[PDB]
Symmetry: D2
Subunit: 143 residues, 4 copies
């Protein structure tokens, strides 16, 4: 996958006891949730407070996921904050892909790529990526 740019937005996730399975590490089932929380935080930072909730319910733009992939390189535990370095890697006319690197104490625990399309939210109908959103997103896509 693409290496993380210096520019990446970081969303902190506090991992706890209850996120962990009997092997004493974060249950895999929760890791996509953490990544997606980071992407929502990304929208909050660069589009406006309330993340997807604001984007869907106020702006009438949905971004349903069509694909996700993650590689788990090292366990996630409550011993450190999970720093989720998050950035858009591409924006086509129909979809956007975000990268999330989940890092603990400088070790990359997981790397993920998450691809969404765009909808007119209240109609649940696909649309091309709106120009206003393209203007906000493209400055953060690395070379």
């Amino acid at each position: 996958m693409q290496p993380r740019p210096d520019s990446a937005f970081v969303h902190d996730v506090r991992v706890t006891w209850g996120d962990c399975d009997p092997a004493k590490i974060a249950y895999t089932g929760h890791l996509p949730r953490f990544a997606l929380e980071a992407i929502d935080a990304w929208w909050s930072e660069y589009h406006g407070p309330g993340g997807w909730y604001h984007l869907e319910l106020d702006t009438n733009v949905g971004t349903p996921f069509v694909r996700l992939e993650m590689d788990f390189k090292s366990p996630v535990t409550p011993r450190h904050i999970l720093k989720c370095h998050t950035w858009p890697t591409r924006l086509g006319t129909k979809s956007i892909t975000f990268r999330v690197d989940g890092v603990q104490d400088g070790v990359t625990c997981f790397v993920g790529a998450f691809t969404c399309v765009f909808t007119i939210a209240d109609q649940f109908k696909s649309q091309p990526a709106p120009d206003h959103l393209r203007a906000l997103i493209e400055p953060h896509i690395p070379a």
Copy 2:
């Protein structure tokens, strides 16, 4: 219930789209999880990093829950940080009760009381509240 002291530790919870049900508010099913995350953060702040995970796995003290109760006064949404004001309300010889007030933009959304006993973690056997923990906890119990 008891009013929140000025002294209460606050743990911030970021509520998102995916925490919300089709009524556009946080699903009730997740609210106890948020409260419990705040209590774990409380242990991190006053006992040491890693919250319950550290307390159980390193200190060999478990704090299993025996009761929880919550009143939901106003909806929780992604529009604001959920500030979870958290404090111990009592510590007997066998159990501790924590209060959590979940507050958004100054409105109290929920009030909860959560009661745990103490175990020798590796034995899953009850014990009285250890003296060292009592010394850390009692300074934060309000009049």
Copy 3:
């Protein structure tokens, strides 16, 4: 406070698994409310119609948001057995309903809960008294 479960209680099976468990090797307390709520959702499916709260809210336009929950945890929940959630309405007033759920594994009562909801006109997010047609479905299941 909490009433004993009647012979008539609806039982919803919940499969508990590895992923529900914490490092103490039992179901994390934070997941237990979810299981109890799933039971209540299944009660609605059984007595009101398939699709539980989703059907109730989106088709019938009746929401039942929670205003209180309380649970006592008596014994650990594990993946060694099905969690049998014995579920019934203990009370229906003019404005609210309270459901009891006992979570039982191999006949051991692991937790006892009481969960109180009010009623809304779903599409308006406005409170309403319990509608008469729902009252008619609910009341026959409230124990003595």
Copy 4:
């Protein structure tokens, strides 16, 4: 990349409910991996023994931590139907196993996933090659 599901695939039923859904009125993407993992856990219960991963890890001392997952989401998942998770091992090497899960609702394939685990000596959290006794259980279910 992702192989079509065989007639032989184990099917695990997942009940999707209100609480799994987001404000767009479909299952939140973040919960879908959980459903797929539950399916894989059920596969282990079916072919290795009751209690899935919990039994595997805590009784048999074999862990199967995940090293990769990928999912394509083709159609929304809702509470209107049971989610039928068609589940099978697509591959077993010396060190890892890959499970496919197709989540199907009313015959529509809502998502297709592939999930890769390695094997550990559970109590040591140390990698090991796939044990021969598990290989013997797994291989008969790997399609052509």
